Design a protein around this ligand. Structure first.
Ligand SMILES: CCCCCCCC/C=C\CCCCCCCC(=O)OC[C@H](O)CO
Ligand SMILES: CCCCCCCC/C=C\CCCCCCCC(=O)OC[C@H](O)CO
Ligand SMILES: [Zn+2]
Ligand SMILES: [Zn+2]
Ligand SMILES: [Zn+2]
Ligand SMILES: [Zn+2]
Lengths: 224, 224
């Protein structure tokens, strides 16, 4: 999870901060203009995922605990109505009633397990950790910033943008092929494929941002 | 899902395209410069989520079907080893062996159900639809574009950016309060809270993008 949040968050700040930066460079914009947009974009990105992460986590933490309660109240007020819904669960998996019948009886004495299974199928069996909800957001905001920084560094040292964009194109394509392989070392296999696929989303968007940076600048003589 | 993808995708293109646009306006940048960055950013965003959506969906479609096979091969080659892992599942929920013992026997004759449950707990019970995987990406790219367009429209009609940003601030704050309430009409309740919370992520990031647009422009006399 946190390994995914810090790598899935890096691959967003590596692509869009690069794509805009290259697009701005392509439309003959000054390094300084490429930074002001890019840093405005990185920070505006990190806040949006930072709070978006802790608005979904803090909403699902509340919702699944609230959904935990609503199903217990259905298990309590009308015990057979809740029994039938998970009798259906037992039934659903080709389990013939004369054996699962006694199961409900032991379940009616001990709440947790019977509940937990109906719960598993209602709330997805995902009772979450409250602290790791916050840790998900801070880790995704940080990794997203650190990935936006990578395409931007050269424009900080090189004030001709069409000079910097060549250093930026190689640095981040190196970074996309490194952090593409790392997103394949974990989770799904074939890390050389993931490397090339993150490099290719880079290219597609950096080229679209270039197509569109130029198209809006299309009547101006200099970048205005 | 598709209702979430088209509304969760709108709330990204409403916030970051606005935040940069306001930040650029705040640093005394021309409408035309605010469009060239913003349209570069919207398109570079839509490609990144467009392909990111169909690289995770097409990877999990393959992975869970591949994970479906690996567990069947463990269920086949060493039937008792797979039995023990889901005998553990049965055991785990306070189910005493003399009743679930006969369950495994009927399960050893019929593969699907026994498999499906171990599968449910290994692959999250999420065998996915291949077509809806693609529909998720096209719907999130489209909703993300349409949401970037909304903060940008006024700069297209109004060439003084500090004039346009006032129309943009009201249009999209209207849009965040409308599409914040709609993300509360579905999923979690309390839609007036969700409205105000999407409006507030707007403000936090639009203010951070403003803080940073200005800070990089801090030594220039005019926007350079
Ligand atoms: C100067 C000469 C430039 C040579 C570039 C030419 C071909 C490279 C072929 C495409 C890349 C092949 C895969 C590389 C890769 O994925 O490396 C990531 C690494 O594994 C992370 O640890
Ligand atoms: C000119 C006068 C401007 C008045 C603005 C002053 C207070 C508004 C209070 C904050 C907003 C209160 C909630 C509004 C809201 O959420 O509306 C979304 C709607 O439900 C979607 O259908
Ligand atoms: Zn129930
Ligand atoms: Zn029920
Ligand atoms: Zn197993
Ligand atoms: Zn096993």
């Amino acid at each position: 999870e946190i390994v995914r949040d810090i790598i899935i968050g890096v691959s967003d700040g590596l692509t869009v901060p690069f794509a805009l930066a290259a697009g701005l460079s392509g439309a003959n914009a000054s390094s300084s203009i490429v930074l002001t947009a890019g840093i405005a974009e990185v920070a505006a990105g990190a806040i949006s995922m930072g709070l978006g992460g802790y608005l979904a986590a803090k909403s699902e933490a509340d919702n699944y605990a609230r959904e935990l309660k609503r199903e217990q109240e259905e298990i309590i007020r009308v015990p057979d109505t809740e029994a039938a819904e998970v009798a259906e669960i037992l039934a659903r998996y080709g389990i013939e009633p004369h054996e699962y019948g006694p199961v409900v009886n032991a379940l009616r004495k001990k709440p947790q397990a019977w509940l937990d299974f109906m719960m598993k199928f209602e709330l997805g069996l995902e009772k979450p950790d409250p602290k790791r909800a916050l840790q998900s957001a801070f880790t995704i905001a940080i990794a997203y910033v650190l990935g936006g920084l990578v395409p931007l560094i050269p424009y900080m040292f090189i004030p001709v943008a069409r000079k910097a964009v060549v250093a930026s194109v190689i640095l981040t394509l190196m970074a996309l092929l490194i952090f593409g392989y790392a997103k394949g070392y974990f989770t799904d296999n074939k890390p050389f494929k993931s490397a090339l696929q993150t490099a290719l989303i880079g290219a597609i968007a950096s080229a679209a941002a270039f197509g569109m940076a130029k198209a809006v600048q299309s009547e101006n003589l200099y970048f205005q």
